[PDB]
Amino acid sequence: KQHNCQSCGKTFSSASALQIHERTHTGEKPFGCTICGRAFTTKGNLKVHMGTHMWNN
DNA sequence: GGAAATATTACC
DNA sequence: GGTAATATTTCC
Ligand SMILES: [Zn+2]
Ligand SMILES: [Zn+2]
């Protein structure tokens, strides 16, 4: 079966993936960076952001 | 089978 | 550059 966005019609592979896509219509940002405050739309995107805070040699 | 992580593309 | 958005891969 298919999981189509009821807002823009675009189709995604899973229910979980459609639910991540739907975050673009609401503007929600459920993943915060405790260092600078900035909020992000996925876990992975905050994760990649956290690397910009690494002194890391 | 499908959520989750991630690799990748798209967009500014 | 770096964040947004999704496509592909890992994991149960
Ligand atoms: Zn949509
Ligand atoms: Zn930050």
Side-chain angles (χ1 to χ4, degrees):
Chain A
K1 197 242 312 181
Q2 270 174 2
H3 306 74
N4 295 252
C5 184
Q6 311 300 69
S7 287
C8 77
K10 290 200 183 273
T11 305
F12 289 83
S13 36
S14 72
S16 66
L18 174 65
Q19 280 174 318
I20 283 151
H21 156 78
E22 276 173 340
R23 299 184 197 157
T24 75
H25 303 301
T26 86
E28 60 194 88
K29 277 155 181 166
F31 301 99
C33 175
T34 68
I35 284 151
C36 69
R38 291 216 27 175
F40 292 76
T41 69
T42 79
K43 209 175 194 234
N45 281 356
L46 171 68
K47 194 196 154 83
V48 160
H49 157 80
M50 282 289 301
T52 73
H53 287 304
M54 294 303 96
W55 162 63
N56 193 1
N57 314 47

Short mmCIF file of all heavy atoms in Angstrom, two decimals, chain A residues 5-10 12 18 21-22 24-25, ligand 1:
data_model
loop_
_atom_site.label_atom_id
_atom_site.label_comp_id
_atom_site.label_asym_id
_atom_site.label_seq_id
_atom_site.Cartn_x
_atom_site.Cartn_y
_atom_site.Cartn_z
N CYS A 5 0.57 12.08 1.09
CA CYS A 5 0.35 13.28 1.88
C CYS A 5 -1.02 13.84 1.56
O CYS A 5 -1.32 14.09 0.39
CB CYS A 5 1.43 14.32 1.56
SG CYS A 5 1.38 15.84 2.56
N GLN A 6 -1.85 14.04 2.60
CA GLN A 6 -3.17 14.63 2.36
C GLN A 6 -3.13 16.12 2.07
O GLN A 6 -4.17 16.72 1.79
CB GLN A 6 -4.11 14.38 3.55
CG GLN A 6 -4.18 12.95 4.08
CD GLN A 6 -4.65 11.97 3.02
OE1 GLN A 6 -3.95 11.69 2.04
NE2 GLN A 6 -5.85 11.42 3.23
N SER A 7 -1.94 16.73 2.12
CA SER A 7 -1.76 18.16 1.89
C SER A 7 -1.17 18.47 0.53
O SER A 7 -1.65 19.38 -0.16
CB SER A 7 -0.88 18.74 2.99
OG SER A 7 -1.60 18.80 4.21
N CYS A 8 -0.12 17.75 0.12
CA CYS A 8 0.52 18.01 -1.16
C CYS A 8 0.51 16.81 -2.11
O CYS A 8 1.08 16.90 -3.21
CB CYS A 8 1.97 18.46 -0.92
SG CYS A 8 3.06 17.07 -0.51
N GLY A 9 -0.09 15.70 -1.73
CA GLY A 9 -0.17 14.55 -2.60
C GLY A 9 1.11 13.75 -2.78
O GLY A 9 1.02 12.57 -3.18
N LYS A 10 2.29 14.32 -2.52
CA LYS A 10 3.55 13.58 -2.65
C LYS A 10 3.50 12.27 -1.87
O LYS A 10 2.93 12.22 -0.78
CB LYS A 10 4.73 14.43 -2.17
CG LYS A 10 5.09 15.62 -3.07
CD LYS A 10 6.52 16.10 -2.81
CE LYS A 10 6.90 17.35 -3.64
NZ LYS A 10 7.45 17.06 -5.01
N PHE A 12 5.21 8.65 -0.21
CA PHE A 12 6.39 8.23 0.52
C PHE A 12 6.32 6.73 0.78
O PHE A 12 5.29 6.07 0.58
CB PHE A 12 6.53 9.04 1.80
CG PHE A 12 6.92 10.46 1.54
CD1 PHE A 12 5.96 11.41 1.21
CD2 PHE A 12 8.25 10.83 1.55
CE1 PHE A 12 6.32 12.73 0.93
CE2 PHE A 12 8.62 12.13 1.27
CZ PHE A 12 7.65 13.09 0.95
N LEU A 18 6.33 9.35 5.61
CA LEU A 18 5.29 10.35 5.38
C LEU A 18 5.11 11.25 6.60
O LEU A 18 4.96 12.47 6.46
CB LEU A 18 3.96 9.67 5.05
CG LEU A 18 2.75 10.61 4.92
CD1 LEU A 18 2.95 11.53 3.74
CD2 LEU A 18 1.45 9.84 4.78
N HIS A 21 7.83 13.72 6.49
CA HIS A 21 7.53 14.69 5.44
C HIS A 21 6.46 15.69 5.86
O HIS A 21 6.56 16.88 5.54
CB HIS A 21 7.08 13.99 4.17
CG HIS A 21 6.25 14.88 3.30
ND1 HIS A 21 6.81 15.85 2.50
CD2 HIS A 21 4.91 14.96 3.12
CE1 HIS A 21 5.85 16.49 1.85
NE2 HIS A 21 4.69 15.96 2.21
N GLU A 22 5.41 15.23 6.55
CA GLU A 22 4.32 16.12 6.93
C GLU A 22 4.79 17.26 7.81
O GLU A 22 4.14 18.30 7.87
CB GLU A 22 3.20 15.33 7.64
CG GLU A 22 2.21 14.66 6.69
CD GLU A 22 1.19 13.72 7.37
OE1 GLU A 22 1.42 13.27 8.52
OE2 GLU A 22 0.15 13.43 6.73
N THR A 24 6.90 19.32 7.19
CA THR A 24 7.16 20.50 6.38
C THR A 24 5.92 21.38 6.24
O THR A 24 6.05 22.60 6.10
CB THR A 24 7.68 20.09 5.01
OG1 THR A 24 6.60 19.59 4.22
CG2 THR A 24 8.73 19.01 5.14
N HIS A 25 4.70 20.80 6.28
CA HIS A 25 3.51 21.64 6.18
C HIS A 25 3.20 22.36 7.49
O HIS A 25 2.66 23.47 7.45
CB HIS A 25 2.30 20.82 5.73
CG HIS A 25 2.50 20.12 4.42
ND1 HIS A 25 2.80 20.79 3.25
CD2 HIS A 25 2.48 18.80 4.10
CE1 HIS A 25 2.94 19.92 2.27
NE2 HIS A 25 2.75 18.71 2.75
ZN ZN D 1 2.95 17.19 1.74
#
